[PDB]
Amino acid sequence: RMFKITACVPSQSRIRTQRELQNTYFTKLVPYDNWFREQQRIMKMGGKIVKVQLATGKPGTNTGL
Amino acid sequence: SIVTKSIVNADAEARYLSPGELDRIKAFVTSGESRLRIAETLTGSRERIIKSAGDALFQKRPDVVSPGGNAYGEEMTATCLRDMDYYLRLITYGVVAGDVTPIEEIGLVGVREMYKSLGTPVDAVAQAVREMKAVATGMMSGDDAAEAGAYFDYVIGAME
Amino acid sequence: SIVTKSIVNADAEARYLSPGELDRIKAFVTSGESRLRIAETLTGSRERIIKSAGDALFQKRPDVVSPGGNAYGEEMTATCLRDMDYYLRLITYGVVAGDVTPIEEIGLVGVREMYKSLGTPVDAVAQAVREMKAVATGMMSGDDAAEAGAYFDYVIGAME
Amino acid sequence: SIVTKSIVNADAEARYLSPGELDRIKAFVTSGESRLRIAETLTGSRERIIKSAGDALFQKRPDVVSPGGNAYGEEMTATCLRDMDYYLRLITYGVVAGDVTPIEEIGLVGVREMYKSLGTPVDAVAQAVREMKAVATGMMSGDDAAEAGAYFDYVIGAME
Amino acid sequence: SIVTKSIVNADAEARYLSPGELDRIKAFVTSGESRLRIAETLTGSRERIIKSAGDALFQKRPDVVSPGGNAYGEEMTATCLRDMDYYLRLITYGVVAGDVTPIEEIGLVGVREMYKSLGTPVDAVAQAVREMKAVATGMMSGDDAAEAGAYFDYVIGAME
Amino acid sequence: MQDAITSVINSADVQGKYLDGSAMDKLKAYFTTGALRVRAASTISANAAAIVKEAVAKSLLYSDVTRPGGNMYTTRRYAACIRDLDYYLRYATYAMLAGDPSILDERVLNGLKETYNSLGVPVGSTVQAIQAMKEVTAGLVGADAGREMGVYFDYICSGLS
Amino acid sequence: MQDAITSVINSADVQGKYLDGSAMDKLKAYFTTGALRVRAASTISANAAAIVKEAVAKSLLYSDVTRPGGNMYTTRRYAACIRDLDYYLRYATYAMLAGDPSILDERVLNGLKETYNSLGVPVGSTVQAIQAMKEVTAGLVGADAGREMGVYFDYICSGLS
Amino acid sequence: MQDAITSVINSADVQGKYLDGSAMDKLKAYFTTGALRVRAASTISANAAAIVKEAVAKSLLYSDVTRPGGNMYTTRRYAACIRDLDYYLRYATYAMLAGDPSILDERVLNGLKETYNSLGVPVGSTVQAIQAMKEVTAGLVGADAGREMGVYFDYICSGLS
Amino acid sequence: MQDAITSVINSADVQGKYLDGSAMDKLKAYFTTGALRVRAASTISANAAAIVKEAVAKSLLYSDVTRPGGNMYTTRRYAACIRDLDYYLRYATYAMLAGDPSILDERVLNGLKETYNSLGVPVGSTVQAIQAMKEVTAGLVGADAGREMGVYFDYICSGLS
Amino acid sequence: MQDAITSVINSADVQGKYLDGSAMDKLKAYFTTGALRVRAASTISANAAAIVKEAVAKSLLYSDVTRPGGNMYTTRRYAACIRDLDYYLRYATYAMLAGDPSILDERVLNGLKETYNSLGVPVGSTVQAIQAMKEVTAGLVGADAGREMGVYFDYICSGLS
Amino acid sequence: KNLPVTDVDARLKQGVNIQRQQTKAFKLTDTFNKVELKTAIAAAYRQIFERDIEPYIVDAQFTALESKLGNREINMKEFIEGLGCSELYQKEFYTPYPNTKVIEMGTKHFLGRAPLDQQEIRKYNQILASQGLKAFIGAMVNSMEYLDNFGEDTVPFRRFPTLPAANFPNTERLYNQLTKQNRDLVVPSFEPA
Numbered sequence A: 001r002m003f004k005i006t007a008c009v010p011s012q013s014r015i016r017t018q019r020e021l022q023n024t025y026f027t028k029l030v031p032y033d034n035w036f037r038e039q040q041r042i043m044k045m046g047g048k049i050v051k052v053q054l055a056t057g058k059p060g061t062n063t064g065l
Numbered sequence B, C, D, E: 001s002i003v004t005k006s007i008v009n010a011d012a013e014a015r016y017l018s019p020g021e022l023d024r025i026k027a028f029v030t031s032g033e034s035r036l037r038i039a040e041t042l043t044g045s046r047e048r049i050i051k052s053a054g055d056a057l058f059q060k061r062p063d064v065v066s067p068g069g070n071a072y073g074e075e076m077t078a079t080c081l082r083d084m085d086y087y088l089r090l091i092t093y094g095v096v097a098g099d100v101t102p103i104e105e106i107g108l109v110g111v112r113e114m115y116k117s118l119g120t121p122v123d124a125v126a127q128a129v130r131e132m133k134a135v136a137t138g139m140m141s142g143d144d145a146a147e148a149g150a151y152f153d154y155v156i157g158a159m160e
Numbered sequence F, G, H, I, J: 001m002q003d004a005i006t007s008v009i010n011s012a013d014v015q016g017k018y019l020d021g022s023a024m025d026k027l028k029a030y031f032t033t034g035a036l037r038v039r040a041a042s043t044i045s046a047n048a049a050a051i052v053k054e055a056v057a058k059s060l061l062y063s064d065v066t067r068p069g070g071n072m073y074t075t076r077r078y079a080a081c082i083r084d085l086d087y088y089l090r091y092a093t094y095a096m097l098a099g100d101p102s103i104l105d106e107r108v109l110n111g112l113k114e115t116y117n118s119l120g121v122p123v124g125s126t127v128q129a130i131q132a133m134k135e136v137t138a139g140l141v142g143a144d145a146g147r148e149m150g151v152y153f154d155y156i157c158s159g160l161s
Numbered sequence K: 001k002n003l004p005v006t007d008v009d010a011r012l013k014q015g016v017n018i019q020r021q022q023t024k025a026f027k028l029t030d031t032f033n034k035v036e037l038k039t040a041i042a043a044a045y046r047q048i049f050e051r052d053i054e055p056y057i058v059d060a061q062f063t064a065l066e067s068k069l070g071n072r073e074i075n076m077k078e079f080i081e082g083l084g085c086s087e088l089y090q091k092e093f094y095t096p097y098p099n100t101k102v103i104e105m106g107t108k109h110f111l112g113r114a115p116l117d118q119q120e121i122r123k124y125n126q127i128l129a130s131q132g133l134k135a136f137i138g139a140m141v142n143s144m145e146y147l148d149n150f151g152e153d154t155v156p157f158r159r160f161p162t163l164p165a166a167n168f169p170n171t172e173r174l175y176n177q178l179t180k181q182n183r184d185l186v187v188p189s190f191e192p193a
Ligand SMILES: CCC1=C(C)/C(=C/C2=NC(=C\c3[nH]c(/C=C4\NC(=O)[C@H](C)[C@H]4CC)c(C)c3CCC(=O)O)/C(CCC(=O)O)=C2C)NC1=O
Pocket: C064, C069, C070, C071, C072, C076, C077, C079, C080, C081, C083, C084, C086, C087, C090, C106, C107, C118, C120, C121, C124, C125, C128, H061, H062, H063, H066, H067, H073, H074, H075, H078
């Protein structure tokens, strides 16, 4: 069980001189247990979740995650 | 099963399976007939086990069947016996799996949270699985009773 | 060993030993007699194992004993047979312990760095353990050869 | 080259190029003729360098040309000289680049892993590039020999 | 300095010094003689630099010496010339070290917090270093004035 | 962290000797007691919370330490006390399974005295709580399994005192 | 990240040959451009802040963007705008020094398009600002290096559009 | 962490004085020796693993410490010993390049005695290993570069003892 | 971290008793002084930087510690000194508002002596700086508010010494 | 307790070596400075009470510490302060004569910080008193004898702080 | 009344440690040249495990996570969490130490400091009771402080924190030691007020 997330995060709090394109727009694999906390974290950062996949997950399965 | 757990252990340690756990999978493979016999006898007498264990639980802890308690009424007592049916079913699944992990995945993660929601006293459920354990090990032969009592013991340990 | 691995794996998880791990420890405890028999088989005939395996290795890989190789000369060939004796001793330890944490935790972690600093081809060491495995599994019964070849297999796998 | 490395340094430090490294790029620009002469003389006499260095390596370390060794046979010795050709080619690329980074990108990342796969002793390859270094610096004038020996020295340092 | 910066920048990257950084250290090592000549030029004529720069500063910014300003009075003007002497000393340190880590790491990190706690206009301090730069680059040859004006430029840039 | 097998191997290795007959006899003793260790560990894993709450009901309840002013007073302190007793029972089970108390002074008794002395935790009251836990689990698993549990419980009480 | 030198070495490496005379011709072309590349890079590094302020004063200042209703209204968005322009100029200077626009395709135009779509940044105003910056740096550092900066600024605009 | 230049500047700054003639002479001495320091550092970076393995082949091999019971016995201990010797050679190269042993007592000799005394590492055997490493690298880089390497090797051996 | 109210409640709770007349009298004393505490806290929040810079102008300026060799020499050290004095004034304001110095030894005086002794910070000079800060703020807010500020300033100086 | 001669002999003996040329040069340095040490010790023995009372007249008199509430308030505390300053001057004279500060951390700086911290003695005020004593005796015996006195006075102030 | 300066070395030692201006952090902000990535992975190894990882690995053990970082399907922060989760770190820093020691060791490796106050140790030991060591590390890395100081692409590094008054001398006493310098826990807990 694992999600694939493309998400864009803007830094509304402060300007950052260094290049932050990898920080702002990124696609990563996220474990299912960490996904609730990570989704909550992306909510609190103000970034908007753009695409959720869960190709790894095999959803609807009781047994074996 | 034991094979999924050995595979995720060899995966996290990023190596092949050791010959010790290959011998463990082979011994599990040979002991398949004994666990089939245990799960066969448990799937045979599930109603008698549930009836004797539910009456023993209601004799031991009458707070759940009292007015104001959780399992009050015909449908509430029937749902109590239905939950005991689910737990004996998961006991048989873990008995035939050789591992406690399907019992964990299906019925052990959030039982405290959901029974905190429904109002069910969880220690009463632990007493119910204790009575189911005592009755099922009373039915089995002593070595097979020890095997089934290991999984029953794990369930009441994860309860309380 | 098996008990150390089960205790640590339950220890990180903040839980007791699951009953499946407990019958794993129980089955290892019962198979300890055959493990000790394999250990006496490997211990009592170490001279012929080391001698015949060194002979077959230098027959198979003659360049390491030719001038220019690592194990060229009297004392270098003696140190080569000593390293093979070390690995057979670790094989005996892993046979008794029921797991490869003696073998890995003593003589397999920095084996590449050590044999890289000595100037030794590690594939020829894998061939040395291969010939040791051939002589050792030529010395036992079938299941005993399989159980010893599991640990020999782990050593050659941890080489490359 | 030196310009890509100065650019990625000014990028990670998120500033423009300092006048020190602008003067470094300018000095590299003026020393282009000397490095062209060094790479010219190396591309001229590559066969003689490879033949003398391979015979010196086989005279020094005979384990690779022995039976059972890696480079045994006509095609294996020819592939050994082909690998020495690739390394002298990367030496010329790094000599004309002013930096060791194309040698790193093309032939220094996984040479230990791939030569663990093929069975090649990597210290023998370090001896081969040592003999190529000694022969090529024997051919060059002493200042240009110091420049080429810096890159050769870097290759044998990344080997062993 | 240059050597400290190169060592640290290779040190975080877990690598040795790259050859481009090594010829950077080599070029700084060769230019150290001209750096020491600029340092003797700045050291030997510090009286006239501080005097003429203070004169041109108080001509340019007369409000800080007028009643109401920071450097009003005898001891306050003496402390003002002392602060200018401190900055010329740090200029000499940065000239010798080949980099601005002496100047920044001694007298430029919390300069805004310090001069805000003292009640000092920092633009007038930038004008003081500007007049010091004018007198100092009026005192040398062309490339010497450029190399000293780089560090004077860094101090006035780090003010604002 | 080492069981009886790893300590025997470590002694024979620090000697540099092979496994002689005394080491074989020690390992035979451990391989005879191991099934009893397994069954006692399963029985203790059955009744963790019951053994802990019976230990508090024997020693710490209705005394001064649960009253105001005691170190077991608040609900935070009560929950941390139940947590500490669950730790003692869990690690005593681990040391019973290994047959060697190296895990106890490696991972329980390491900085426990200084922690309890910095917090103000009474060491005598928690030693009495561990002793009642030992008494309850020795009533649970029998005579000899209770004894081989009580040797590590006495190890924890001795290192704590 | 490749120079003219590293791209020449790379192209001679994929087909597998050594250095031919045409590669030496490209290398000497790179060097005879690279001397004035160095002087133009020093001039751009000296005057980067004035170049960026003249670029925004030329194109973006008295429009709807720096006004309310535009994406350059707040001081947060203005500071982000000046930082975006500084980064375009710095990476154009790196591409001018290397003689290859692979850095602009590698680090600038990698995911800049989709974040510019997602934040709602106008592409046309950015392209106008970059072209204004292009002839500002062309009038600053000279004609031939102005063309050098011109094709790399145009590479940034073509990757943006 | 300071080289000869930073220590000279720190002395002149703690004085509060300008750089007088003695500081100029010290910096001229360092700027004369720096090219030899650079070439010796390149030659030592060439042969790191060879110098380390020749130091073990001179001192630690075929003695009791590689036999059973020794502290260099196991493969883990052998790999950690090679790691420690590589650390000593690398930091001696750094202190040779800086011309000041401040990095050695800042980053090697800080808690090294207490670490080795807690682990059971023999200090005399590792001092002999560092001395053989010094002898091998002084045979490698010559007389005077070997001497200016051996002063920091003797610094490491003195701080270790 | 507890004010006068929470400490009174904690004493009555550790007793297990209800709030008797002495606790009522203590809380009446705090509820009479609280308005003066509020007004003094507002007046101190008005002039934070002025009180800090007047404390440095009284004690630390023009002495040896701002000269070369002093621990307040560099601009980094000056900024860290102003930061430390702002911390002392801010936490003295907090302890004045709470009416209990528990926040001072919880969050200022916890590892402050060992930090200052490891850094080389002079404790007597910073005690004199805190005393001058106390003198300035007691000149600011009056006699009795200055006294109830100076009791926590003396608490900080006593825990620092 | 060891002078320069005994420390040189102890280094050569812990080496097990004979006295080489560097030890001979160190002893020649001490045997050249010894007559100046003797004359400065006689001049300091001349004016013990004058140097002590001038140090109190410079630093501690007319400050808060001689006022009520200060730690130098009573006549007992004044007499003990004069006794402590006489100790510092006497042991600085001894360390000047030996040319080694081993007597200072053997017999002054051993438990002095913990004694002063238990009594409530201000360490900064006594460090300023020792600094004024150093200034007075350096005015007494000259430049270089004052410097070789001030190195041990700074040793006492560093060990006290 | 100027005298010549003695105790020069005590004026050079006088300081916060200069390493905070001489240790460089690690943004993975290019992600496209492979030596950059190899040095970043080596710095992640040396910063979490405190040593060179190579004498503790039978083979190249983290090749799956390193190859996933090479594609940047994963980020550097989840690579740090995966380094914390698997068995080498657990056999390195979780086995020979109690929970109240692995709390400050895991704060030292991942957050780059010591624990702040008593409530931090209480909630971390609560996690070490309820759940795994791996869930403790996942609580550390997915926390807000990790994303605020280091971020997603940056390897954590040695922080020099001020404002919790315990935090600086505890961090200095933690990072000044070498690995296996002693068995003592540097703070057991904080005494109440
Ligand atoms: C128990 C784990 C363990 C191992 C494996 C171990 C190996 C080990 N092998 C060594 C040497 C050696 N080992 C070999 C072995 C070989 N060379 C060949 O060509 C053959 C392929 C191969 C053996 C069949 C040789 C030739 C040397 C000598 C290297 C030299 O003299 O430079 C040495 C250095 C001398 C010594 O103190 O013995 C060690 C420590 N030590 C250990 O504690």
